Design a binder for this molecule. Structure first.
Ligand SMILES: Nc1ncnc2c1ncn2[C@@H]1O[C@H](COP(=O)(O)OP(=O)(O)O)[C@@H](O)[C@H]1O
Ligand SMILES: Nc1ncnc2c1ncn2[C@@H]1O[C@H](COP(=O)(O)OP(=O)(O)O)[C@@H](O)[C@H]1O
Ligand SMILES: Nc1ncnc2c1ncn2[C@@H]1O[C@H](COP(=O)(O)OP(=O)(O)O)[C@@H](O)[C@H]1O
Ligand SMILES: Nc1ncnc2c1ncn2[C@@H]1O[C@H](COP(=O)(O)OP(=O)(O)O)[C@@H](O)[C@H]1O
Lengths: 235, 235, 235, 235
């Protein structure tokens, strides 16, 4: 019956915002490698929505060149007059982006070319801004250090989020007005399976729409039917 | 609680500024080869901010041609009407840059092509200006002298900065208002590990943000937790 | 303490042998598509060991041509003088294999080329022998019928084995001298997870070697530690 | 003064032999991913020296094809008449190796091609033998499962050895006749640094040769000078 809230502040959200503002004021590189679906991508957008001098792209592996990725960052900076060459684009980024005290956020940092991440790190370095890397744990695996040596020299704050915590789903249940202890344990058990935030949010939205269609309150059995869907135990 | 200082004058900063002004008034070549993250890059920018007729580029290995690097120096000179050919660009640099009594600073001089550094040395020579090389100790290793013979004849003041000194981190503690002798020894021990200035700055900024978030003073335990992060003993 | 038995007769083994002898006497094609690790590959070898005029290859996708696969069947027939051309090999198979009333078994029938399975079906047809296909459920998916039309007309007895049964693991516990009902339920729960026969056999062999190294009987806790290994809930 | 012993039974050696004999009797695949220099390679050779029906290759990335690697295994089987084609070699391995109840050991399993490890797993499977994979933790990273899906279904006993234990270096000190508790703590501290078994063995051999050249007993100061060598804190 109430409106579903899309985003909730969580222990991971608190942690990752402190890491984000750390790389902001620190003006240095923060790598966030974690399990898939730990909710990192969404929080970054909440940081972008709440804070000034913040930018974010995503990297599809289609846009995984230096040219394409810097073009993406340039259009995110609003310079629609960006040149299609590498060089003058790099110069335009260097003139535009330095002195703003900003924070660049990059998602899926595993698909970075060495020249790609190289130009990014030398950019923020030659720009006095923030760069923050996201994605899975292949990002730190791509460094483990003569090709990534000076880059490993400046990793300010890595923060690994493997899975959720109990206060994480507890604040989730607080935001979704969930009071059952059986409900809380079931939410925790759902959080034990991967795609944690995504599956939990899906399960929450299935139960909310089912209880709204039946005119009832979200309860434990709606959550059981929701989790009984999705083919999680079906190969 | 106070504002963090962005830059601190240091014994290396004193040394390297004297080398920088030496190559300036001397109008000759100074190679600064050191360990990675000795803080040389940052000081160069303080020299650029404090002094007139000073320019600086960075060299990504993307921009490692003669054409690209001279284009970078040209846009740093503000000649946005620079030609995309090598020749007329070299002529425009020769007319623009001679007679100003300036100082060109070049970072990461290890990725120089022989024609690249060749055109740079013949430039400053035919320009009555200063050139200063930065980077790791591969720059002097690329010369050790019939291809680099007259260039090794040019060299005015090499200054090797391997690691920090104790007065270095002492002036750091003076700038960061640090009075603990246990704190001073811990800062020195952090300076013994590579990425010296970078890790120390990271550690200083971690402790400052943690003590500001907890409302307290930066103390030894915040420094221990900061250094306990970053995976320095983790492979 | 007793000798571990490598193979046990099972409800799937009974079913699949009846399908195998059916395609034998019927001299027609039987496709066995199932989930991975349903134990089909091993049983086929028990059929090969117990029965005369039985042959079996495996198909690695390295050997997935008509030439390579028929060469494999030829060396399985013991004709080491087989020609390296397609044609005379096909003739040698046609002369050797017809009149023996045999049964060809082919594993991993999903990696069949259309010409590959085409030559196989026209072989057995022009040979008065048996062909039996194995593998996952992509084999029937590759037919779902103008390129596979007459082949879908040959189909004699498909038998899909998705997962195990309770009498399956019951005869497993009879062969492994397992009498605990808690043990039986735990074996069933292990059979609910994929790689059923393989994981169960691994678990049985872990518990047997652990109880033999500790001088004890296989019990429930050894099975729990065995299943606690293998990273089944670890991504 | 006594003879140095090269190999000592250790907790990792006990663990890894139990995993090795497990994959032997189990006739299934055991992946041993660990940190570099955890001493796994040597123990494998002790298993090869002590046990019958055991074979081992190494994989240089020069020999990283299916053809080259199977050729290596064939020459390890003593069939010097092995064919230089893939197919008849695979057939010769299939006829030679099945029925012996053997154990193949493969080192550096990270450099496996998909067809390479594919032919190996289908080999042991079509051979009723043992395969055991070694190397760093990139082997399990290359699987994390539709290209490696049935292979991840094969996996019997992974054993990760990150670093040593205290009983490990304790049995080392027992084999090397080391009784000092200061000596024991120093050996443990050396074991905390990577290249554990190798550096410790190097340190042991430096101290043994120095004390033999000086006519004395190995003591703590010889160990300190040995560890003071090797440039472990020098970049
Ligand atoms: N605080 C939150 N509240 C609700 N859903 C969240 C929250 N944080 C993340 N999510 C969910 O996580 C997903 C977005 O991030 P996600 O895709 O998990 O990132 P990544 O795949 O990079 O780990 C969506 O399902 C989103 O609803
Ligand atoms: N005087 C200084 N005060 C504060 N930080 C400094 C100072 N000198 C260097 N740094 C730090 O060093 C880095 C910039 O130079 P650096 O990257 O170490 O140069 P290089 O890699 O070429 O040796 C940044 O982390 C910067 O904060
Ligand atoms: N009757 C049986 N008794 C014991 N183990 C069996 C039995 N049948 C199959 N297995 C096990 O199953 C595997 C053989 O079949 P498998 O290769 O899994 O078939 P597929 O992967 O083609 O479905 C081996 O692990 C083997 O030990
Ligand atoms: N039991 C042991 N006692 C002494 N040294 C050992 C022992 N086991 C292994 N080593 C040492 O380990 C090395 C051989 O294995 P290693 O190179 O560490 O394997 P990997 O590189 O695959 O981890 C040699 O330095 C060898 O002396």
């Amino acid at each position: 019956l109430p409106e579903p809230p899309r985003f909730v502040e969580t222990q991971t959200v608190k942690q990752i915002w402190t890491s984000m503002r750390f790389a902001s004021l620190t003006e240095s590189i923060a790598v966030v490698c974690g399990n898939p679906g730990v909710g990192k991508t969404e929080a970054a957008r909440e940081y972008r929505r709440t804070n000034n001098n913040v930018w974010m792209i995503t990297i599809t592996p289609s846009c995984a060149s230096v040219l394409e990725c810097l073009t993406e960052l340039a259009f995110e900076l609003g310079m629609n007059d960006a040149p299609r060459r590498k060089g003058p684009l790099s110069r335009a980024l260097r003139r535009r982006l330095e002195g703003t005290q900003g924070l660049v956020i990059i998602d899926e940092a595993d698909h970075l070319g060495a020249e790609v991440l190289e130009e990014l790190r030398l950019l923020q370095e030659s720009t006095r801004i923030g760069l923050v890397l996201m994605g899975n744990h292949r990002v730190y695996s791509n460094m483990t250090t003569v090709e990534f040596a000076r880059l490993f020299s400046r990793i300010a704050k890595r923060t690994a989020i493997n899975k959720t915590k109990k206060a994480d789903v507890k604040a989730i249940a607080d935001a979704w007005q969930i009071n059952g202890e059986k409900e809380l344990e079931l939410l925790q058990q759902i959080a034990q399976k991967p795609g944690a935030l995504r599956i939990l949010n899906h399960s929450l939205r299935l139960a909310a729409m089912t209880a709204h269609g039946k005119g009832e309150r979200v309860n434990e059995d709606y959550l059981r039917q929701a989790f009984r869907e999705l083919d999680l135990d079906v190969d």
